[PDB]
Design a protein around this ligand. Sequence first.
Ligand SMILES: [Ca+2]
Ligand SMILES: [Ca+2]
Ligand SMILES: [Cl-]
Ligand SMILES: [Cl-]
Length: 330
Amino acid sequence: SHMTAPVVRNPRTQFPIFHWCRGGKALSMLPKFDTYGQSKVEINIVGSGSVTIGNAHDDLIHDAVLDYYGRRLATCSSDKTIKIFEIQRLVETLIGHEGPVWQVAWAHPKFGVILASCSYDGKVLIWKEDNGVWNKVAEHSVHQASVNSVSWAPHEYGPVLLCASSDGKISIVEFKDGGALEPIVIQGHAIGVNAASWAPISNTRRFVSGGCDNLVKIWRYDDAAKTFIEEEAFQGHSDWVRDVAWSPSRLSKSYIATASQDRTVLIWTKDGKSNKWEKQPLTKEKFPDVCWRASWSLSGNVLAISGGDNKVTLWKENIQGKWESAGEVD
Ligand SMILES: [Ca+2]
Ligand SMILES: [Ca+2]
Ligand SMILES: [Cl-]
Ligand SMILES: [Cl-]
């Protein structure tokens, strides 16, 4: 051929995982290599007793999350599967996805022992444990692209899943009658959506999303419109927003953290008695590599960030409203 336009070649990676206590147990996963240059990816589960699950999958692990009673661990992988451990023994491998599984999320226990998974294959699958055995119970297949995140609503809203896709859309669907049958699907972000997370209960129902237009958006359920409408669109990031986290403190003042492949985290806040949002960078300097995941403690408003620095870094706001390092998880 005769090609005058520039042609480039481009390429996939393992990041750390951490979550705050469930059933008394915190979880961490810090990638390492040994002396033979072999990956050693150990999931540590630490209570007030520690258990280590080594090599849960042979391929990349994209998520690892305990259930709310800290009795089960779900891990998911580029190998297209989800593994369920009782915590240790491997109990089941959940087979159904046709591409990498990016995230899993546990439903509130009032609904049962239920896991949602999202995948490159464009599906959200819902799995349920009954009498110690796992079965696929529903499929939510409205996206025409990778589905990058899944999150269950506050249980007061019902068993409702929030899903973000590379097709630019966000879907919100209630699981009922062994199906996912009446979804709301909205155009969320240009190019793609990477994450969406629920606000804590207020009765206005909100969530926040981040995507490939470098924007963070806040959405509210409108009673008159009977759908979710865009309430805020926050500028600040200079590259794709990779994760968004709405702090579960629900006392007056709201906190949202947004993590970006621009190598920064922005903290957005709104005073209880204000309608105005304000932003502050988490850190004075860029992180060494992308910021991939963010999550807040249940109390104390401590922020955990995972990224290509290969660390889980912790952050705490000081008396003067500035963020300081609180160490890192080992
Ligand atoms: Ca797209
Ligand atoms: Ca999250
Ligand atoms: Cl979860
Ligand atoms: Cl969070």
